[PDB]
């Protein structure tokens, strides 16, 4: 029933942890890989699908300057919500500018 496994590297090392996200593919795994790499506190962030017969991804996040690597991953997700929310708000308010120019043009 679970959907996320955190795997520490050497037990004590919480700087490197490979988030194994269940029921995924390169849709969120590549959008997250773009957002976590936009953090200067992240030395390395790469993902891979495990095997295409499976539907889970690996997502390595490893940081510098002593941050636990779930804080660039919470910031990795919320800063994608804030991007899709703004894309949604500039899309639904640009369709309406198109509908209300198709209406009030020669009708």
């Amino acid at each position: 029933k679970t959907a996320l496994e955190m795997v520490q590297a050497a037990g004590t090392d919480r700087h490197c942890v490979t988030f194994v996200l269940h029921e995924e593919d390169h849709t969120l795994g590549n959008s997250l890989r773009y957002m976590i790499m936009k953090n200067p506190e992240v030395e390395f962030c790469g993902y891979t699908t495990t095997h295409p017969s499976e539907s889970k991804i690996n997502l390595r996040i490893q940081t510098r300057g002593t941050l636990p690597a779930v804080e660039p991953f919470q910031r990795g997700l919320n800063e994608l919500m804030n991007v899709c929310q703004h894309v949604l708000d500039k899309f639904e308010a640009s369709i309406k500018d198109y509908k209300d120019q198709k209406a009030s043009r020669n009708e």
Binding site: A3, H26, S31, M35, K38, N78, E79, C84, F91
Partner: protein, 309 residues
């Protein structure tokens, strides 16, 4: 540099080009490929729709086989709103009011009695000989007649040739529409094709005149490069480089491959979403943006469930 959220909300803009029914074309300045590809790949496989899953036959006396008819009915778009309905919990053969829809394709072919003199045309000899999808009767169950008016739950295209009959032959089946995402099977996808392309730029590094401009005018697509007269000579200027197919034809001519710099404009994608008709196309792009947020919220809920702290 890092993700300045106010650099994004200043440079992003969507410019809708064409939107009639069952089509949409819009631009996206300033989004990167790892988000635009996520929108494209959520349109093709994540936005859920309704489609036929079980088929309960009685007397398929037709030529189209019992298996191929069920597969052919699976690929017919149902004009039900997917957001009203739920997923079926596994193992239920008869779903409830909320899970499933029903239909009934009950067609019998017979000869035309009258006006059948010296003719071999099938429309004049036979009645019900081309089983179209306008022969499907929606059979609402529970209280589904009250949620939807007369004429909402319906096949979309009502011209799709399902079978083809001769007299004596009958099709008496019963269907069960379910809900699913477009990657469990391809019959659930809402979109014909959803794609993008970068806006090309074309930069005349040298002013070309005369007949070399007409030779340039035909290397690109019709409408990209325009030839204008300026005092006896015909000089070429680009005009709307969106039209270009990016076919690299100018890099075959020798003297003119070193005057234009055919490249692409970064992060200026031109989408196009063509719906199959189950939902309008600007509602499919909205419920494709809103799926990536749900994929973020589910993992934020899992992080809240792991660490209480």
């Amino acid at each position: 540099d890092a993700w300045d959220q106010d650099r994004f909300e200043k440079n992003f803009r969507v410019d809708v080009v064409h939107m009639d029914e069952n089509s949409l074309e819009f631009d996206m300045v300033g989004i990167d490929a790892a988000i635009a590809n996520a929108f494209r790949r959520i349109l093709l496989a994540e936005v859920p729709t309704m489609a036929v899953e079980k088929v309960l036959v009685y007397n398929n006396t037709s030529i189209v086989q019992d298996e191929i008819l069920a597969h052919r009915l699976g690929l017919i778009p149902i004009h039900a709103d997917p957001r009203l309905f739920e997923y079926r919990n596994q193992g239920d053969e008869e779903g409830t009011e909320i899970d499933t829809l029903q239909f009934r394709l009950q067609v019998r072919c017979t000869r035309n009695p009258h006006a059948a003199k010296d003719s071999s045309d099938p429309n004049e000899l036979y009645v019900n000989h081309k089983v179209y999808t306008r022969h499907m009767t929606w059979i609402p169950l529970g209280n589904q007649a009250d949620l939807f008016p007369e004429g909402t739950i319906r096949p979309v295209h009502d011209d799709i040739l399902i079978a083809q009959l001769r007299p004596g032959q009958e099709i008496d089946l019963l269907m069960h529409c379910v809900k699913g995402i477009g990657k469990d099977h391809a019959k659930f996808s809402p979109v014909a094709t959803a794609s993008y392309r970068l806006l090309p730029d074309i930069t005349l590094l040298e002013p070309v005149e005369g007949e070399a401009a007409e030779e340039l005018s035909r290397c690109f697509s019709p409408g990209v490069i325009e030839v204008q007269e300026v005092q006896g000579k015909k000089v070429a200027r680009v005009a709307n480089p969106r039209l270009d197919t990016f076919s690299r034809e100018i890099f075959r001519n020798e003297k003119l491959k070193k005057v234009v710099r055919l490249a692409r404009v970064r992060d200026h994608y031109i989408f196009s979403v063509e719906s199959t008709g189950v939902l309008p196309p600007d509602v499919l792009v909205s419920e494709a943006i809103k799926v990536l947020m749900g994929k973020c919220r589910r993992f934020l809920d899992e992080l809240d469930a792991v660490q209480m702290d």
